[PDB]
Amino acid sequence: DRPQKPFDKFFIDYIGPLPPSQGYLYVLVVVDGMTGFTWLYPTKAPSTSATVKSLNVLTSIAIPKVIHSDQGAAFTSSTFAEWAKERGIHLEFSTPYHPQSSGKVERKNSDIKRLLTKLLVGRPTKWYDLLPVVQLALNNTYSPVLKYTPHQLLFGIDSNTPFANQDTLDLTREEELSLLQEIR
Amino acid sequence: DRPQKPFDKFFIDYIGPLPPSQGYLYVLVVVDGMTGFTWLYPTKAPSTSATVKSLNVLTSIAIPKVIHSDQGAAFTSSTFAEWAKERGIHLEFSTPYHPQSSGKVERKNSDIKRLLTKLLVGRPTKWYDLLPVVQLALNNTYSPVLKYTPHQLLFGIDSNTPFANQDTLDLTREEELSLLQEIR
Amino acid sequence: LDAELDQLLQGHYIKGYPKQYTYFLEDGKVKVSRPEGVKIIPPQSDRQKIVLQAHNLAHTGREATLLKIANLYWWPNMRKDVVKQLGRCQQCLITNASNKASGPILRPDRPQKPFDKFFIDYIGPLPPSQGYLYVLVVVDGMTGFTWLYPTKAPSTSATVKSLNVLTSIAIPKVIHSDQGAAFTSSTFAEWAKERGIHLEFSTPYHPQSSGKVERKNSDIKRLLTKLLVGRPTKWYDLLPVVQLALNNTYSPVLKYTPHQLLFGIDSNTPFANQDTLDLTREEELSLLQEIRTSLYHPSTPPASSRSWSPVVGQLVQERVARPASLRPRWHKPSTVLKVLNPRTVVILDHLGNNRTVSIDNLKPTSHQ
Amino acid sequence: LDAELDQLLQGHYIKGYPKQYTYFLEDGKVKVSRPEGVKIIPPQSDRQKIVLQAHNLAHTGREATLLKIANLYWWPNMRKDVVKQLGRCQQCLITNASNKASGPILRPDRPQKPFDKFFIDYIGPLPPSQGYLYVLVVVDGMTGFTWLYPTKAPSTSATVKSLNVLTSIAIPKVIHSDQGAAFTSSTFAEWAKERGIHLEFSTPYHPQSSGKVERKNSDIKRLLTKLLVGRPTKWYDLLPVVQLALNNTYSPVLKYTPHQLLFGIDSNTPFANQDTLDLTREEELSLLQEIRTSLYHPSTPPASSRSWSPVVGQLVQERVARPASLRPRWHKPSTVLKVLNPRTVVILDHLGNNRTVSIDNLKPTSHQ
DNA sequence: ATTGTCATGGAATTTCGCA
DNA sequence: TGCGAAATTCCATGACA
DNA sequence: ATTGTCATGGAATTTCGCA
DNA sequence: TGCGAAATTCCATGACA
Ligand SMILES: [Mn+2]
Ligand SMILES: [Mn+2]
Ligand SMILES: [Mn+2]
Ligand SMILES: [Mn+2]
Ligand SMILES: [Mn+2]
Ligand SMILES: [Mn+2]
Ligand SMILES: [N+]
Ligand SMILES: [N+]
Ligand SMILES: [Zn+2]
Ligand SMILES: [Zn+2]
C-alpha cells in the first residue's frame, strides 16, 4: 500500500445549531485526514445546498479523492451525490450510529468542539469574526504523535503564526458559571 | 542693388463696395511685387480692423518687408501703423491722387478688376464662393514679360491647375445688356 | 487503436513504438515502462479526446498541455497531436497574443514637389477656446509646410470650409488621410473629384501611415503647451503664431525650414537667411530645385530577429478594432489575397469582404 | 563687449577670435568674413538677448536654435551660449521629452517561502455580473498560487473581507501592493498591524513593480475571455473555475504548477502527477524543499546603448501623473537625495517633500 | 485599394586653427 | 602631417496618433 | 520608504533510437 | 561514434497594468 497523502481524504461534519452570528447558525468542518488540516465554513443550515456552496469554495483550492461523513441528510441526498460524481470525488459513509474516522481526526474534532465552546462563551454571538483565528490556532497546534503541525505537513514550511502558548482549552470558574447562566 | 525677390513688397488695396455676398462687401487685394502673386480677402468694411484681421491670416504664411498702399483711411490710421511696426514691416504710401505701383502690379490690378466684373455679372451675389477659383486663375496666368506665371515664380514648379485656355476677359453681348439691367 | 496496440503486446514491432522498451497489459490498459515512469498508452482512437481534455483545463499552449498529458500517458509524437488541436481551437486562436513581430517599416519616397501630396488630420478635442475644440492640420509632404485651422468639430463641412481657403493658393494632386468620418464621407469625395484631387486613405487603425502629419501634431501640441505654461489654455489666438513659428523652424537633419523648402527664400521674419541675396530669383529657383532633390532620405531599418512577412494564401488574423471587455482581441482567420507591399495586404475577411490592411494589425495564424 | 571688440578692429589678437580672418566695421557694427559669408559679431553684452530671441521663436533645441543665429551672427563658441539658455528655459525643461532610456530592469529574488510575500491588486471594472464589478487578485510570490475574490468596488472594506477569508489558511509576512486608495488607507494599515503583516508599496504609477500580479491578471482575463466566447459575459460563476484552472497549470520554464509549488503534491484534479506515489509525505516535503530552491531565476538584461543611471545630487524630473490637455508632462527639476537601488530613488521634490520614485518616471534634466 | 516621422541632446566623428 | 578643441554629424529615444 | 513577469510557438540545440 | 528524427530548451514578443 502507498503512503498516506494530503487530499487523500477529507472528513466533513456539521456542528450546531449555534447562537446566531451575523445570520449564521452552523459550521461545516473539513479536516484533511493525512495532515489534520482544518477548514471551517459558516452556514445557515445543515443542508445539501449549504454544503455544496461551502465545498465549492474549498474545492476551488484543492479537491479530495474521497469525502468521509456520517449519514446526515445533507450528505446522503442525491444532489450531494451528483455533485461529487461530477468532480470525481468518491463518497464514504460511516455506518449509522457508529461514527468512525481516525485517531488523528477524532482528536481534532474534539479540539474543534472544545475550542469553539471556550470562546463561544462571554461572546456567544461574535463567533463569525473569530473563525479565521480559530483555524490558525488549530492548524498551528503541535501534534504529539507527529513532530509537526498541520500547517507544516500541508505546506512543508514553518508558519508566520506559531501558537507557542499551547493553551488551557478547559473552562475557567467564571466561564462555567456564565455558561450555566446563558443556558438558563 | 540686389535683385528683386518675393516678399520684398506687398501691394494692397480695397475694391468695393460690392453687392452683398454671404455678408461681405469688399475685397482686400494683395499682390506680391516681384512674382505678381495675388491673395484676396473678403471683408465687411474698408477699415483698419478688417485690414488687420485679413493681414493676420496672410502674415501667418509670409511676412513682407514693405507694404505699399494708397492713402486710404484703413492704411494711414495709427492702429495700422502700430500693427506694422510690431511686425518689422515698413509702410509705404503713394502720394494722394497719384497712384504709383509698378507696370506688373498695375496690369495685375486691371486683370483683377476686370475678371471680377466678368463673373460678378449674372451672379452679383455669389462671389464669395468664387474667390478661390479667381485667385487660381490669376496666379496660373502666363506673364508676357516673364516666361513664367506667379505660381511658378513663387514656388519654383509647374502647378496642377494650369489655365491653358487664356480667356476672353471682355464682356459678351448678353452680359453688357444685363449689367445695364442690374445697374438700373 | 485496439488493432495496432495488440501486435505490440505480443512483442512484434510497430513504427513509432521503440522496440527496446517493454509493453504490457495491466488493469485493462496497455502500458509501457519509460525512464520517467510507467505511462498508459491509449488507443489511437482515444487520443484526440485526451489532448482536448488536457488543453481545455486552462486552454494552454504546446508545452503546458503536453506536461499535463505526459503525467498519465505516452504515445508516439504526442506534440504533433497537441499542435493539431491548438491549430483548431477557435477560442485560443482568437484570444492568444502573437509572438512574431511585424517586418521592418517602409520609408516611402518624399513627394517630389510641393503640392504633390497633402497629409491631413484632426487634433482634439482641446479645452474650449472661443467655442473651438479642434484643429485641422494640413501638411505638405515634400516641404513639411503646414496650415492650421481651428474648428468646432472634426466634420466634413469644416474640412471643406478650411480647404477651400487653403486651395485658394494651390490645388494638390493628392490628399492623404486616415479613415476618419470627416474624410470618407461622400460629400468630401465629391468635393475632391470636383477639383481633380485624388483621395488616398491610410489602412484602418494605423496612424503610422499618416506619420507625416501625426508627427507634426506632436510639434504643434508641444509648442502650444510651452506658450501656455502658467496661463489659461487660450489656444485659439496662438494657432497663427504656432503655424508661422513651425513653418520657419529648421529641421537639423535637413538644414532647411519648411518655408525655405516651399519658397527657396525666407520672408520678413526673425533671423532670415541671406545667402541668396545676390542671386536673381531664377538663380535662386534653380538652387532650390537642386536643394529639393538632394534631401536626406531614411532607409528601411533591419528586420527584428523574429518577424514575419505576409505570403499570398497565408492564414492571418486581423486585430479587433475596439474590443469589448473580456472579448477576443482577434478576428477569425482569413486569407491573404494580395501582397500590395511587404507591409500592406488585401485579405478576404471570410464574410467575405476584401479589406486592405496593415500587417501591424495582423498576426499570422499559429500551428499552420 | 565694446571693450573686447575694439582691440580686435585694430588687428591685435583676442583668445577665441581666430587671427587668420579679417574683422572690420560697417553700418555701425563689427563684422567678420567667414567661409559661409559675412556675419555680425555682437558685443558679449548683447549675446544672451540674441540666443534668447532665436530660441523663443519656436522653443527649439541646440542645432535648430543655432541655425537661426548663424544666419546673422558669429561669435566664439556659440553653442556654449545656446546650451546655457536651454538649461535655464523652464518651458523647454518641463515640456520636452527625454531621449535617454532607463537603466536595465532588476529581477528581484523570488520569495523563499510560500506566505513570505503576497502581491495584491484589483482587476476591473468588468461588465456587471451578479452585481459584481471587480476581482481582488492575491498572488503568492514564491509559488504563483493565486486567490480570486469578486467585489462590488475596489475598497478597503472589500479587501479586508476577502483577506480575512484568505488569512484563515495562513498569514503572510508581507503584502505588496500599488498605491491604490484601497491599500493606502489607515483602516487597511490597522488591519495589517493588527496581524503582524508588513505593508510594502510600489513606487507610484509603476505597475511593473507589482509585475507578479499584473502578469497574473493577464492570464485571468485571457482564460475568462476564452470561456466566454459567444456567450454573455457572466464571469462571476467562473472565478472559482479560473482560480482552480490557473493554480494547476504548468509554467513551461519551471516545469511545475503553482499548486505543486505550494503543496508538493497534486490534488484530485485531471492529469494529476503521480511521480511521488511511493514516497512518504516527509520524503515528498524534502524533495519539495529541494525543488523550491533550484527554480530558474532570470538575470538582469543588458543596458540599452543610451541609458542613464541616477547619481546622488543629480537634477532629475518626475513625470506628471495625469497631465491635463496642453500641459507639461514633466515636473520642475528636483534633486536625487538617495539611490535606493539603480532603479529606485528618493528625490526632494523641491516643495520640498521626500518622494520614493522609479527611474521610469524620471528624466535626467538636460544641459546639466 | 497602399507605405511612419523627426526634434532632441549626448557621443562619435570630422574639421578647424595653428604650427 | 599632427595636436587639442570646436563644429558637425550621428542616432536612440519617444511621442504623434 | 524599494525592485517587472511569464505564456507562447517557431527555431536552435540536445537527446534518443538504432546500428 | 555517427545519423535522422524527436524532444527539449531557448527566447523574442506582447500584455498585464
Ligand atoms: Mn454529523
Ligand atoms: Mn484704394
Ligand atoms: Mn486622426
Ligand atoms: Mn492596480
Ligand atoms: Mn491623429
Ligand atoms: Mn493593475
Ligand atoms: N514609394
Ligand atoms: N532582491
Ligand atoms: Zn484553447
Ligand atoms: Zn524654450
PDB file of N, CA and C in Angstrom, chain D residues 218-289:
ATOM      1  N   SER D 218      -3.368  39.242 -16.583  1.00  0.00           N
ATOM      2  CA  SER D 218      -3.374  38.854 -17.964  1.00  0.00           C
ATOM      3  C   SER D 218      -3.898  37.412 -18.119  1.00  0.00           C
ATOM      4  N   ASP D 219      -3.371  36.456 -17.359  1.00  0.00           N
ATOM      5  CA  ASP D 219      -3.832  35.082 -17.549  1.00  0.00           C
ATOM      6  C   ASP D 219      -5.309  34.934 -17.170  1.00  0.00           C
ATOM      7  N   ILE D 220      -5.720  35.650 -16.124  1.00  0.00           N
ATOM      8  CA  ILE D 220      -7.072  35.554 -15.608  1.00  0.00           C
ATOM      9  C   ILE D 220      -8.066  36.052 -16.664  1.00  0.00           C
ATOM     10  N   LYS D 221      -7.795  37.242 -17.198  1.00  0.00           N
ATOM     11  CA  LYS D 221      -8.612  37.836 -18.226  1.00  0.00           C
ATOM     12  C   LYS D 221      -8.589  36.991 -19.499  1.00  0.00           C
ATOM     13  N   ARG D 222      -7.432  36.429 -19.841  1.00  0.00           N
ATOM     14  CA  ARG D 222      -7.297  35.672 -21.077  1.00  0.00           C
ATOM     15  C   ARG D 222      -8.137  34.380 -21.047  1.00  0.00           C
ATOM     16  N   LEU D 223      -8.092  33.661 -19.927  1.00  0.00           N
ATOM     17  CA  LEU D 223      -8.908  32.469 -19.733  1.00  0.00           C
ATOM     18  C   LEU D 223     -10.399  32.807 -19.624  1.00  0.00           C
ATOM     19  N   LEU D 224     -10.731  33.886 -18.926  1.00  0.00           N
ATOM     20  CA  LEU D 224     -12.125  34.311 -18.828  1.00  0.00           C
ATOM     21  C   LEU D 224     -12.703  34.623 -20.216  1.00  0.00           C
ATOM     22  N   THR D 225     -11.906  35.285 -21.044  1.00  0.00           N
ATOM     23  CA  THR D 225     -12.336  35.649 -22.364  1.00  0.00           C
ATOM     24  C   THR D 225     -12.631  34.400 -23.194  1.00  0.00           C
ATOM     25  N   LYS D 226     -11.697  33.448 -23.184  1.00  0.00           N
ATOM     26  CA  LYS D 226     -11.863  32.196 -23.915  1.00  0.00           C
ATOM     27  C   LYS D 226     -13.140  31.456 -23.482  1.00  0.00           C
ATOM     28  N   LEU D 227     -13.405  31.404 -22.184  1.00  0.00           N
ATOM     29  CA  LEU D 227     -14.528  30.618 -21.717  1.00  0.00           C
ATOM     30  C   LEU D 227     -15.843  31.323 -22.029  1.00  0.00           C
ATOM     31  N   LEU D 228     -15.774  32.624 -22.305  1.00  0.00           N
ATOM     32  CA  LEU D 228     -16.973  33.411 -22.553  1.00  0.00           C
ATOM     33  C   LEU D 228     -17.276  33.681 -24.039  1.00  0.00           C
ATOM     34  N   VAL D 229     -16.432  33.185 -24.936  1.00  0.00           N
ATOM     35  CA  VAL D 229     -16.650  33.329 -26.377  1.00  0.00           C
ATOM     36  C   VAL D 229     -18.082  32.909 -26.766  1.00  0.00           C
ATOM     37  N   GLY D 230     -18.748  33.771 -27.537  1.00  0.00           N
ATOM     38  CA  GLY D 230     -20.133  33.566 -27.952  1.00  0.00           C
ATOM     39  C   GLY D 230     -21.123  33.305 -26.833  1.00  0.00           C
ATOM     40  N   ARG D 231     -20.816  33.729 -25.608  1.00  0.00           N
ATOM     41  CA  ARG D 231     -21.821  33.733 -24.533  1.00  0.00           C
ATOM     42  C   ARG D 231     -21.830  35.117 -23.889  1.00  0.00           C
ATOM     43  N   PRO D 232     -22.930  35.476 -23.201  1.00  0.00           N
ATOM     44  CA  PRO D 232     -22.848  36.751 -22.463  1.00  0.00           C
ATOM     45  C   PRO D 232     -21.800  36.707 -21.329  1.00  0.00           C
ATOM     46  N   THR D 233     -21.167  37.845 -21.066  1.00  0.00           N
ATOM     47  CA  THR D 233     -20.035  37.933 -20.141  1.00  0.00           C
ATOM     48  C   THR D 233     -20.390  37.741 -18.643  1.00  0.00           C
ATOM     49  N   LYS D 234     -21.006  36.599 -18.330  1.00  0.00           N
ATOM     50  CA  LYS D 234     -21.372  36.203 -16.970  1.00  0.00           C
ATOM     51  C   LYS D 234     -20.155  35.569 -16.269  1.00  0.00           C
ATOM     52  N   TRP D 235     -19.223  36.421 -15.839  1.00  0.00           N
ATOM     53  CA  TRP D 235     -17.946  35.973 -15.302  1.00  0.00           C
ATOM     54  C   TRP D 235     -17.938  35.534 -13.813  1.00  0.00           C
ATOM     55  N   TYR D 236     -18.833  36.085 -13.000  1.00  0.00           N
ATOM     56  CA  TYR D 236     -18.921  35.725 -11.587  1.00  0.00           C
ATOM     57  C   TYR D 236     -18.816  34.214 -11.317  1.00  0.00           C
ATOM     58  N   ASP D 237     -19.646  33.423 -11.976  1.00  0.00           N
ATOM     59  CA  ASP D 237     -19.655  31.984 -11.737  1.00  0.00           C
ATOM     60  C   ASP D 237     -18.408  31.268 -12.221  1.00  0.00           C
ATOM     61  N   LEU D 238     -17.513  31.959 -12.917  1.00  0.00           N
ATOM     62  CA  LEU D 238     -16.332  31.289 -13.454  1.00  0.00           C
ATOM     63  C   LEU D 238     -15.068  31.588 -12.665  1.00  0.00           C
ATOM     64  N   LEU D 239     -15.103  32.604 -11.807  1.00  0.00           N
ATOM     65  CA  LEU D 239     -13.941  32.885 -10.986  1.00  0.00           C
ATOM     66  C   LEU D 239     -13.398  31.619 -10.329  1.00  0.00           C
ATOM     67  N   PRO D 240     -14.267  30.826  -9.648  1.00  0.00           N
ATOM     68  CA  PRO D 240     -13.757  29.627  -8.976  1.00  0.00           C
ATOM     69  C   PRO D 240     -13.108  28.653  -9.945  1.00  0.00           C
ATOM     70  N   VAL D 241     -13.697  28.476 -11.121  1.00  0.00           N
ATOM     71  CA  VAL D 241     -13.132  27.587 -12.119  1.00  0.00           C
ATOM     72  C   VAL D 241     -11.775  28.113 -12.608  1.00  0.00           C
ATOM     73  N   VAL D 242     -11.708  29.418 -12.860  1.00  0.00           N
ATOM     74  CA  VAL D 242     -10.483  30.003 -13.372  1.00  0.00           C
ATOM     75  C   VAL D 242      -9.360  29.894 -12.331  1.00  0.00           C
ATOM     76  N   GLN D 243      -9.682  30.211 -11.072  1.00  0.00           N
ATOM     77  CA  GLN D 243      -8.731  30.071  -9.952  1.00  0.00           C
ATOM     78  C   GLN D 243      -8.156  28.662  -9.922  1.00  0.00           C
ATOM     79  N   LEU D 244      -9.048  27.675  -9.848  1.00  0.00           N
ATOM     80  CA  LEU D 244      -8.574  26.292  -9.888  1.00  0.00           C
ATOM     81  C   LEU D 244      -7.762  26.033 -11.168  1.00  0.00           C
ATOM     82  N   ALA D 245      -8.274  26.461 -12.332  1.00  0.00           N
ATOM     83  CA  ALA D 245      -7.612  26.129 -13.622  1.00  0.00           C
ATOM     84  C   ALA D 245      -6.189  26.652 -13.673  1.00  0.00           C
ATOM     85  N   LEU D 246      -6.011  27.914 -13.283  1.00  0.00           N
ATOM     86  CA  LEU D 246      -4.671  28.536 -13.314  1.00  0.00           C
ATOM     87  C   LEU D 246      -3.713  28.001 -12.238  1.00  0.00           C
ATOM     88  N   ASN D 247      -4.219  27.666 -11.057  1.00  0.00           N
ATOM     89  CA  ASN D 247      -3.340  27.185  -9.997  1.00  0.00           C
ATOM     90  C   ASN D 247      -2.761  25.822 -10.340  1.00  0.00           C
ATOM     91  N   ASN D 248      -3.421  25.121 -11.264  1.00  0.00           N
ATOM     92  CA  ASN D 248      -2.992  23.791 -11.681  1.00  0.00           C
ATOM     93  C   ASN D 248      -2.387  23.719 -13.094  1.00  0.00           C
ATOM     94  N   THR D 249      -2.034  24.883 -13.632  1.00  0.00           N
ATOM     95  CA  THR D 249      -1.417  24.982 -14.957  1.00  0.00           C
ATOM     96  C   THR D 249       0.112  25.060 -14.840  1.00  0.00           C
ATOM     97  N   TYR D 250       0.801  24.333 -15.704  1.00  0.00           N
ATOM     98  CA  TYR D 250       2.240  24.328 -15.683  1.00  0.00           C
ATOM     99  C   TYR D 250       2.823  25.627 -16.225  1.00  0.00           C
ATOM    100  N   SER D 251       3.870  26.112 -15.575  1.00  0.00           N
ATOM    101  CA  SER D 251       4.760  27.053 -16.208  1.00  0.00           C
ATOM    102  C   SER D 251       5.882  26.304 -16.946  1.00  0.00           C
ATOM    103  N   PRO D 252       5.897  26.393 -18.289  1.00  0.00           N
ATOM    104  CA  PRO D 252       6.920  25.668 -19.050  1.00  0.00           C
ATOM    105  C   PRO D 252       8.360  25.904 -18.579  1.00  0.00           C
ATOM    106  N   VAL D 253       8.689  27.098 -18.109  1.00  0.00           N
ATOM    107  CA  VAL D 253      10.077  27.370 -17.703  1.00  0.00           C
ATOM    108  C   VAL D 253      10.394  26.707 -16.366  1.00  0.00           C
ATOM    109  N   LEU D 254       9.384  26.559 -15.509  1.00  0.00           N
ATOM    110  CA  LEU D 254       9.587  25.965 -14.187  1.00  0.00           C
ATOM    111  C   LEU D 254       9.350  24.460 -14.184  1.00  0.00           C
ATOM    112  N   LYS D 255       8.475  23.972 -15.067  1.00  0.00           N
ATOM    113  CA  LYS D 255       8.036  22.557 -15.071  1.00  0.00           C
ATOM    114  C   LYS D 255       7.230  22.197 -13.834  1.00  0.00           C
ATOM    115  N   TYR D 256       6.599  23.188 -13.217  1.00  0.00           N
ATOM    116  CA  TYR D 256       5.751  22.965 -12.074  1.00  0.00           C
ATOM    117  C   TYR D 256       4.508  23.834 -12.170  1.00  0.00           C
ATOM    118  N   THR D 257       3.407  23.360 -11.594  1.00  0.00           N
ATOM    119  CA  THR D 257       2.247  24.189 -11.402  1.00  0.00           C
ATOM    120  C   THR D 257       2.355  24.929 -10.065  1.00  0.00           C
ATOM    121  N   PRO D 258       1.647  26.048  -9.925  1.00  0.00           N
ATOM    122  CA  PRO D 258       1.716  26.714  -8.628  1.00  0.00           C
ATOM    123  C   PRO D 258       1.189  25.843  -7.476  1.00  0.00           C
ATOM    124  N   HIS D 259       0.194  25.009  -7.753  1.00  0.00           N
ATOM    125  CA  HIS D 259      -0.339  24.095  -6.748  1.00  0.00           C
ATOM    126  C   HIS D 259       0.790  23.193  -6.217  1.00  0.00           C
ATOM    127  N   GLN D 260       1.502  22.567  -7.146  1.00  0.00           N
ATOM    128  CA  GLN D 260       2.672  21.757  -6.816  1.00  0.00           C
ATOM    129  C   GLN D 260       3.675  22.551  -5.996  1.00  0.00           C
ATOM    130  N   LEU D 261       3.915  23.806  -6.341  1.00  0.00           N
ATOM    131  CA  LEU D 261       4.913  24.554  -5.589  1.00  0.00           C
ATOM    132  C   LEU D 261       4.418  24.822  -4.173  1.00  0.00           C
ATOM    133  N   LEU D 262       3.101  24.878  -3.982  1.00  0.00           N
ATOM    134  CA  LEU D 262       2.583  25.171  -2.662  1.00  0.00           C
ATOM    135  C   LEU D 262       2.472  23.926  -1.761  1.00  0.00           C
ATOM    136  N   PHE D 263       2.112  22.788  -2.356  1.00  0.00           N
ATOM    137  CA  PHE D 263       1.780  21.599  -1.588  1.00  0.00           C
ATOM    138  C   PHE D 263       2.715  20.414  -1.869  1.00  0.00           C
ATOM    139  N   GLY D 264       3.502  20.488  -2.939  1.00  0.00           N
ATOM    140  CA  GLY D 264       4.374  19.367  -3.329  1.00  0.00           C
ATOM    141  C   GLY D 264       3.631  18.100  -3.762  1.00  0.00           C
ATOM    142  N   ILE D 265       2.326  18.207  -3.973  1.00  0.00           N
ATOM    143  CA  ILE D 265       1.555  17.072  -4.472  1.00  0.00           C
ATOM    144  C   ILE D 265       0.239  17.527  -5.115  1.00  0.00           C
ATOM    145  N   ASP D 266      -0.077  17.001  -6.293  1.00  0.00           N
ATOM    146  CA  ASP D 266      -1.366  17.306  -6.931  1.00  0.00           C
ATOM    147  C   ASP D 266      -2.549  16.792  -6.139  1.00  0.00           C
ATOM    148  N   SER D 267      -3.656  17.517  -6.192  1.00  0.00           N
ATOM    149  CA  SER D 267      -4.888  17.038  -5.598  1.00  0.00           C
ATOM    150  C   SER D 267      -5.713  16.280  -6.639  1.00  0.00           C
ATOM    151  N   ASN D 268      -6.971  15.980  -6.322  1.00  0.00           N
ATOM    152  CA  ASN D 268      -7.811  15.186  -7.221  1.00  0.00           C
ATOM    153  C   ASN D 268      -8.337  15.996  -8.425  1.00  0.00           C
ATOM    154  N   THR D 269      -7.434  16.405  -9.304  1.00  0.00           N
ATOM    155  CA  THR D 269      -7.818  17.176 -10.485  1.00  0.00           C
ATOM    156  C   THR D 269      -7.283  16.429 -11.695  1.00  0.00           C
ATOM    157  N   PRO D 270      -7.785  16.747 -12.890  1.00  0.00           N
ATOM    158  CA  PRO D 270      -7.390  15.954 -14.038  1.00  0.00           C
ATOM    159  C   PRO D 270      -5.896  15.956 -14.321  1.00  0.00           C
ATOM    160  N   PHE D 271      -5.393  14.788 -14.689  1.00  0.00           N
ATOM    161  CA  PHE D 271      -3.994  14.604 -15.073  1.00  0.00           C
ATOM    162  C   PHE D 271      -3.045  14.845 -13.927  1.00  0.00           C
ATOM    163  N   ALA D 272      -3.446  14.432 -12.731  1.00  0.00           N
ATOM    164  CA  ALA D 272      -2.622  14.608 -11.546  1.00  0.00           C
ATOM    165  C   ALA D 272      -1.288  13.892 -11.737  1.00  0.00           C
ATOM    166  N   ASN D 273      -0.196  14.552 -11.367  1.00  0.00           N
ATOM    167  CA  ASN D 273       1.121  13.944 -11.466  1.00  0.00           C
ATOM    168  C   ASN D 273       1.298  12.901 -10.376  1.00  0.00           C
ATOM    169  N   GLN D 274       1.934  11.785 -10.703  1.00  0.00           N
ATOM    170  CA  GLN D 274       1.955  10.631  -9.798  1.00  0.00           C
ATOM    171  C   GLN D 274       3.344  10.171  -9.365  1.00  0.00           C
ATOM    172  N   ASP D 275       4.364  10.890  -9.806  1.00  0.00           N
ATOM    173  CA  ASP D 275       5.745  10.551  -9.520  1.00  0.00           C
ATOM    174  C   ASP D 275       6.102  10.288  -8.062  1.00  0.00           C
ATOM    175  N   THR D 276       5.395  10.883  -7.105  1.00  0.00           N
ATOM    176  CA  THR D 276       5.777  10.711  -5.696  1.00  0.00           C
ATOM    177  C   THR D 276       4.835   9.779  -4.941  1.00  0.00           C
ATOM    178  N   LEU D 277       4.179   8.893  -5.681  1.00  0.00           N
ATOM    179  CA  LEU D 277       3.209   7.993  -5.080  1.00  0.00           C
ATOM    180  C   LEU D 277       3.837   7.080  -4.016  1.00  0.00           C
ATOM    181  N   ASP D 278       5.106   6.710  -4.223  1.00  0.00           N
ATOM    182  CA  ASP D 278       5.793   5.749  -3.356  1.00  0.00           C
ATOM    183  C   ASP D 278       6.640   6.414  -2.269  1.00  0.00           C
ATOM    184  N   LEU D 279       6.675   7.743  -2.252  1.00  0.00           N
ATOM    185  CA  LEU D 279       7.394   8.443  -1.204  1.00  0.00           C
ATOM    186  C   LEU D 279       6.467   8.668  -0.042  1.00  0.00           C
ATOM    187  N   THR D 280       7.022   8.748   1.154  1.00  0.00           N
ATOM    188  CA  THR D 280       6.257   9.179   2.313  1.00  0.00           C
ATOM    189  C   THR D 280       6.039  10.695   2.205  1.00  0.00           C
ATOM    190  N   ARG D 281       5.085  11.229   2.957  1.00  0.00           N
ATOM    191  CA  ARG D 281       4.854  12.653   2.902  1.00  0.00           C
ATOM    192  C   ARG D 281       6.163  13.382   3.169  1.00  0.00           C
ATOM    193  N   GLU D 282       6.862  12.937   4.208  1.00  0.00           N
ATOM    194  CA  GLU D 282       8.109  13.543   4.647  1.00  0.00           C
ATOM    195  C   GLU D 282       9.164  13.486   3.553  1.00  0.00           C
ATOM    196  N   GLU D 283       9.234  12.380   2.825  1.00  0.00           N
ATOM    197  CA  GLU D 283      10.166  12.314   1.705  1.00  0.00           C
ATOM    198  C   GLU D 283       9.765  13.310   0.610  1.00  0.00           C
ATOM    199  N   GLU D 284       8.458  13.391   0.369  1.00  0.00           N
ATOM    200  CA  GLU D 284       7.843  14.336  -0.564  1.00  0.00           C
ATOM    201  C   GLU D 284       8.169  15.784  -0.192  1.00  0.00           C
ATOM    202  N   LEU D 285       8.009  16.150   1.088  1.00  0.00           N
ATOM    203  CA  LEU D 285       8.292  17.515   1.561  1.00  0.00           C
ATOM    204  C   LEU D 285       9.767  17.879   1.469  1.00  0.00           C
ATOM    205  N   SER D 286      10.605  16.860   1.465  1.00  0.00           N
ATOM    206  CA  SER D 286      12.028  17.052   1.419  1.00  0.00           C
ATOM    207  C   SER D 286      12.428  17.310  -0.035  1.00  0.00           C
ATOM    208  N   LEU D 287      11.850  16.538  -0.961  1.00  0.00           N
ATOM    209  CA  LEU D 287      12.001  16.792  -2.404  1.00  0.00           C
ATOM    210  C   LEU D 287      11.398  18.142  -2.841  1.00  0.00           C
ATOM    211  N   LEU D 288      10.296  18.562  -2.219  1.00  0.00           N
ATOM    212  CA  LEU D 288       9.729  19.877  -2.478  1.00  0.00           C
ATOM    213  C   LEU D 288      10.639  21.014  -1.998  1.00  0.00           C
ATOM    214  N   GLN D 289      11.282  20.832  -0.848  1.00  0.00           N
ATOM    215  CA  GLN D 289      12.213  21.845  -0.331  1.00  0.00           C
ATOM    216  C   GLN D 289      13.356  22.056  -1.318  1.00  0.00           C
TER     217      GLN D 289
END
